[PDB]
Amino acid sequence: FRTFPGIPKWRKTHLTYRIVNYTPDLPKDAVDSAVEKALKVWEEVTPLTFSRLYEGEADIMISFAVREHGDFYPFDGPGNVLAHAYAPGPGINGDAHFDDDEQWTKDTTGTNLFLVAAHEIGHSLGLFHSANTEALMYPLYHSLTDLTRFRLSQDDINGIQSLYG
């Protein structure tokens, strides 16, 4: 596993999240559950707890955007960059942006929202990319991951535990 440099991490165990806007691609129920399933994956192997907010600035702000969106890292249209997230911290740190030029499905085939979200949240937690090919955090997880058999790898686990005990 790898972490970000200087090892940023959350300094509290109770974190909030807010889903700002929705993707045309799916029903809202479907996005709520993708996200919620993704946070729970992580919540099961760390002493952290996530609670949803409907207003205010939540620690982890989740939104859908295209091209330029208020940070230095413009989306790039269909394909390539799918999403981006920031290491733990205040303001924009911990936030996750999803490329709405992508076609978000609940499928085994296509860009799966649950899987991308699960990977992006590892970054919001303080994990960087892994060399282990079976890891959720390896860069090509999006293509090699068989959703039927979905589980955190031991690498994933050893990494988040080295941060949160």
Ligand X SMILES: O=C(C[C@@H](NC(=O)OCc1ccccc1)c1ccccc1)Nc1nnc(S)s1
Which of 17, 95, 117, 118: binder of Ca ion (CB under 5 A)? 95
Q: Which of 36, 68, 120, 134 is catalytic?
A: 120
From 46, 41, 82, 85, select the one nearest 62 (Cα to Cα): 85
Residue ranges of alpha helices (H) inside the chain are 28-43, 113-125, 141-144, 154-164
Please, which residue, 37 or 84, has the CB nearer to ligand X? 84
Q: Segment contacting Ca ion (CB under 5 A): 9-17, 45-53, 79-87, 120-128?
A: 79-87
Q: Does 73 bind ligand X (CB under 6 A)?
A: yes
From 64, 40, 56, select the one nearest 121 (Cα to Cα): 40
**Count of Cβ atoms closer than 10 Å to residue 27 Cβ:** 10
Whether residue 78 contacts residue 70, with contact meaning beta carbons closer than 8 Å, is answered with: no
The entry of Ca ion, Zn ion, ligand X, none near residue 25 (CB within 5 to 8 angstroms by kind) is: Ca ion
Q: How far is the CB of 116 from Zn ion (least distance, A)?
A: 9
Which of 4, 9, 46, 63: binder of ligand X (CB under 6 A)? 4
**Residues 31 to 70: which contact ligand X by CB under 6 A?**
none
Q: How far is the CB of 12 from Zn ion (least distance, A)?
A: 5
Residues in the chain: 165
CA dist 77 and 67 (Å) reads: 7
Query: Is 120 marked active-site?
Result: yes
Whether residue 93 contacts residue 87, with contact meaning beta carbons closer than 8 Å, is answered with: yes
**Residues found near Zn ion in the complex (CB under 5 A):** 12, 71, 97
**Residues found near ligand X in the complex (CB under 6 A):** 4-6, 8, 73, 84-87, 89, 93, 120, 123
